[PDB]
RNA sequence: AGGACCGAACCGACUAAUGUUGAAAAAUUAGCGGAUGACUUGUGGCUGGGGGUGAAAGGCCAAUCAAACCGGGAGAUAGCU
RNA sequence: GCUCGCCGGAAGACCAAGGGUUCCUGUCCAACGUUAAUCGGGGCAGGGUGAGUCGACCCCUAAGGCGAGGCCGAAAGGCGUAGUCGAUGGGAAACAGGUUAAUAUUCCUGUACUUGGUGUUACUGCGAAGGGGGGACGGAGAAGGCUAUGUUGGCCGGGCGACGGUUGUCCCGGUUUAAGCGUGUAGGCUGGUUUUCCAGGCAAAUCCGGAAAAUCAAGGCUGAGGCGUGAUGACGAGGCACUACGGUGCUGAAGCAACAAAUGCCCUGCUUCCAGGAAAAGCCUCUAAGCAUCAGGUAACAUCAAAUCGUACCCCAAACCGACACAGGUGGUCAGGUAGAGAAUACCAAGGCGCUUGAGAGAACUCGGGUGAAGGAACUAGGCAAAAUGGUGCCGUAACUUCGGGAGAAGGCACGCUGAUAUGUAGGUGAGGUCCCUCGCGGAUGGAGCUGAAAUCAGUCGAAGAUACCAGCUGGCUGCAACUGUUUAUUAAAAACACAGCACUGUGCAAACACGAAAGUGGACGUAUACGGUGUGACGCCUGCCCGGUGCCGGAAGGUUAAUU
């Protein structure tokens, strides 16, 4: 049976990309808190 | 009109391999490892004004780095561009 | 003209087809095709607001002029076209000056007929002139509510409005719904009546007829009037009966 | 032409069996329906949770739903183990 | 290296998403492989991806996103103009052969082709964020031609058979060749040429469109394929000389005729149809300001450049998603032979594999199958599971019915091979030649060779002639539902859902309703033959009486009533 995860770089980078996240203020706060925590990879590494 | 120092710095060093030797003995081709950008015009100018030989066509390709993980330590190689230069007139090394 | 297809199989066992041979066959006037295709019945937000709508076969939009600002320029009708957007058909009128525009085809309009607008046009079906020059007691179609728009009333198939009296600057009408309304006499009107009025004869045969027209099935889940405008009470005389 | 029949790919598994600490946190064995349209699918966008969507099962919204996940109120309260 | 077996509309080959070096060489067996592991998709070192002609990239675009001004909202924030992003579509160009352990339409021999700049030759009206052409479009059907491909005949080179015959109507392998150029055929489309005028194409226009006249009716557009060049070229079995036994150089002839034929092309066409079936850029013509010896445009000439990014590997799986080297899922293209209605089924061509534990034992019992004397649902809640027919053409085929259907109703007739009709029949495919002939991608002719069913008679084999796989069991009564379809993914696929039709009710356009504190949007770029909500559900006979109460409509002598003063 077809599974839930269907890989797609376009979909991933359009739904959770850096620019898309930073477009809205909420994603800006998400990035700020992730930077404060110290995550090596903020969103995705294309 | 390609400026100076840029031509000297564009190319890194020649590459030695069995395929390179076969190309040299077949079509007198030279295989070089060059900088990241390494535009075709820059490579042409550097070869013309450094090896004082004529170049027919310049072909370039990008070689992806490998992985040499030493155990829980993923260290990937750097990136470099391989360029094939055809002279058709220079019987040099 | 209605043809009863033989009951070969259910689903088109009881269909009724409304065919009309004189209607033009072929592609429409390409220079007059534009956007506003099937919208899907979704607002800007994206939620359902007109439930039981959606889908439907792709349909192009043809620009149709109702203002009829072209006055004193006779035009010749060349052919009749079927517009999927509206039940009524349209007529391709070529003006003597070279304009090719669309207009609702009345019942009495056939191929090769002369139509002229303005305040000097003859009183025959298909002409358009201000209602101030419309004799009282003559049925009308494509009635206009305010000048400059063109035919905001009686645009559906087989819709007519009978003029009862003028009574001063305004004019009193009687809409097909059965209500009398007062309208500005300066509004433009079109003589004659709209074209083919055989819309109820067709029964759509089967589910697909309604399904591909853009109508979704209605799922099962009285006398409470909801009219509250309080601005057009003076304009309107009495409600429908 | 036929929301036609017989019938391939394709489409949900209806039927007896296997499996019930499996190969699989839902498949296979052999029959069964549609298979020119209310059909199916690839690629992009929208409908964000007291809301969405729903040919209506109170189904689905990430292997979960008569109200999804994350951090906080919050070491909620508990005449109960 | 050989034998046996499987897939061979895949278990084969090529692509995009997917993973990112797992691909090749040298080396090791601790773990990783459900077992030993010299092996490998495991560890270390090295190598590999060559583009103006692939694609991306890039000019403008659909759905949709962002959004300068501006509107709204206590702010975050919501819609939205010009504008800008956004393929899943549209725009310029390439193939034969060879090569490496691994890459090719990228490298090598050739034919070639598109775009832009530079300077010259001769000519001249050039110049848009504008107009016009087309770009530019739906479901279904078909005939007529052609191509890949397959078959047959001749030809080329080699053979006389481990065992009865095999110098012949015998066997073996081949009988392949691109883009471009000129021809413009089969087919389809269009009626053209000349002159005058015009309330239009936002102002104007030689361009489009409209109105007048003269003339021809033969002119134009599109258009697969075949033809000669391409190509005295490449390939070519098989042979002749040098081998590190992996290989190297040279030679090399036929390479032609007939038939079948596609889902591929002619065809973005033809006929029908209602459900009426996108926009923009690319290209061509004219005009706004401007320039009108200038600058620019036109055809040719020589030259320059077409930057940047991936080109390995699997792509119906061991490499992606499922925690796995998992009996699962994954879009597009290539589509041979035998018989057959076919892309199902049975065996084969090239290609890939025997699926990561094996050998014995031949017990009960479990799972999937083969036959079984007599009975044939008698067991079981239950014809559940099983068992049987299963196709072709012909004869025949009831009640009812909306006259479509029931129906393939039920039930019977023959199915192999060989000879004759007919050494292979009708049909089709179809060479030369006569006559003329624009005289050749011309027509009346007339038969070469090939498919050969279908139909009748006769002979013969076996118990069975659709003898393989594949392949409806059959009728009646009866409740339910108009039929087809849709959900309870994962206990109930229906007697539940909707469904085409019908009835009531509200909506006069800034419509009702809904999403929203609000701009705004759907309704609808629609206008009472339309839309929203409710109930039933084709079709035939009807929906009859009743207004107590509850919701609804029209409101009135009158009793009651807040804010407010």
Numbering used by the authors:
A (entry chain 2): 1 to 46
B (entry chain T): 1 to 93
C (entry chain C): 1 to 221, 252 to 271
Reproduce, without paraphrasing, sentences from the article in which this PDB structure was first reported.
The E. coli 50S large ribosomal subunit is composed of 33 proteins (L-proteins), one 23S and one 5S rRNA. The 23S rRNA consists of six architectural domains that, stabilized by the L-proteins, define the shape of the 50S subunit with its three protuberances. Here, we present a biochemical and cryo-EM based analysis of the earliest period of 50S assembly, utilizing an in vitro reconstitution system with purified rRNA and L-protein components. Taken together, early 50S assembly occurs in a domain-wise fashion, while late 50S assembly proceeds incrementally.
To differentiate states occurring during late assembly, emerging structural features such as the central protuberance, or helix 68 were added to their names (C-CP, or C-CP-H68). Subsequently, state C transitions via intermediate steps into state C-CP-H68 (48S). Next, H68 can form upon integration of bL33 and bL35, while bL35 rigidifies the CP. In addition, the fixation of H68 seems to involve contacts with uL1. Furthermore, the L1-stalk associated H75 and CP associated H88 provide RNA contacts and stabilize H68. Accordingly, late step 1 assembly terminates with the “48S” particle C-CP-H68, sharing most structural features with a mature 50S subunit, but lacking a properly arranged FC.
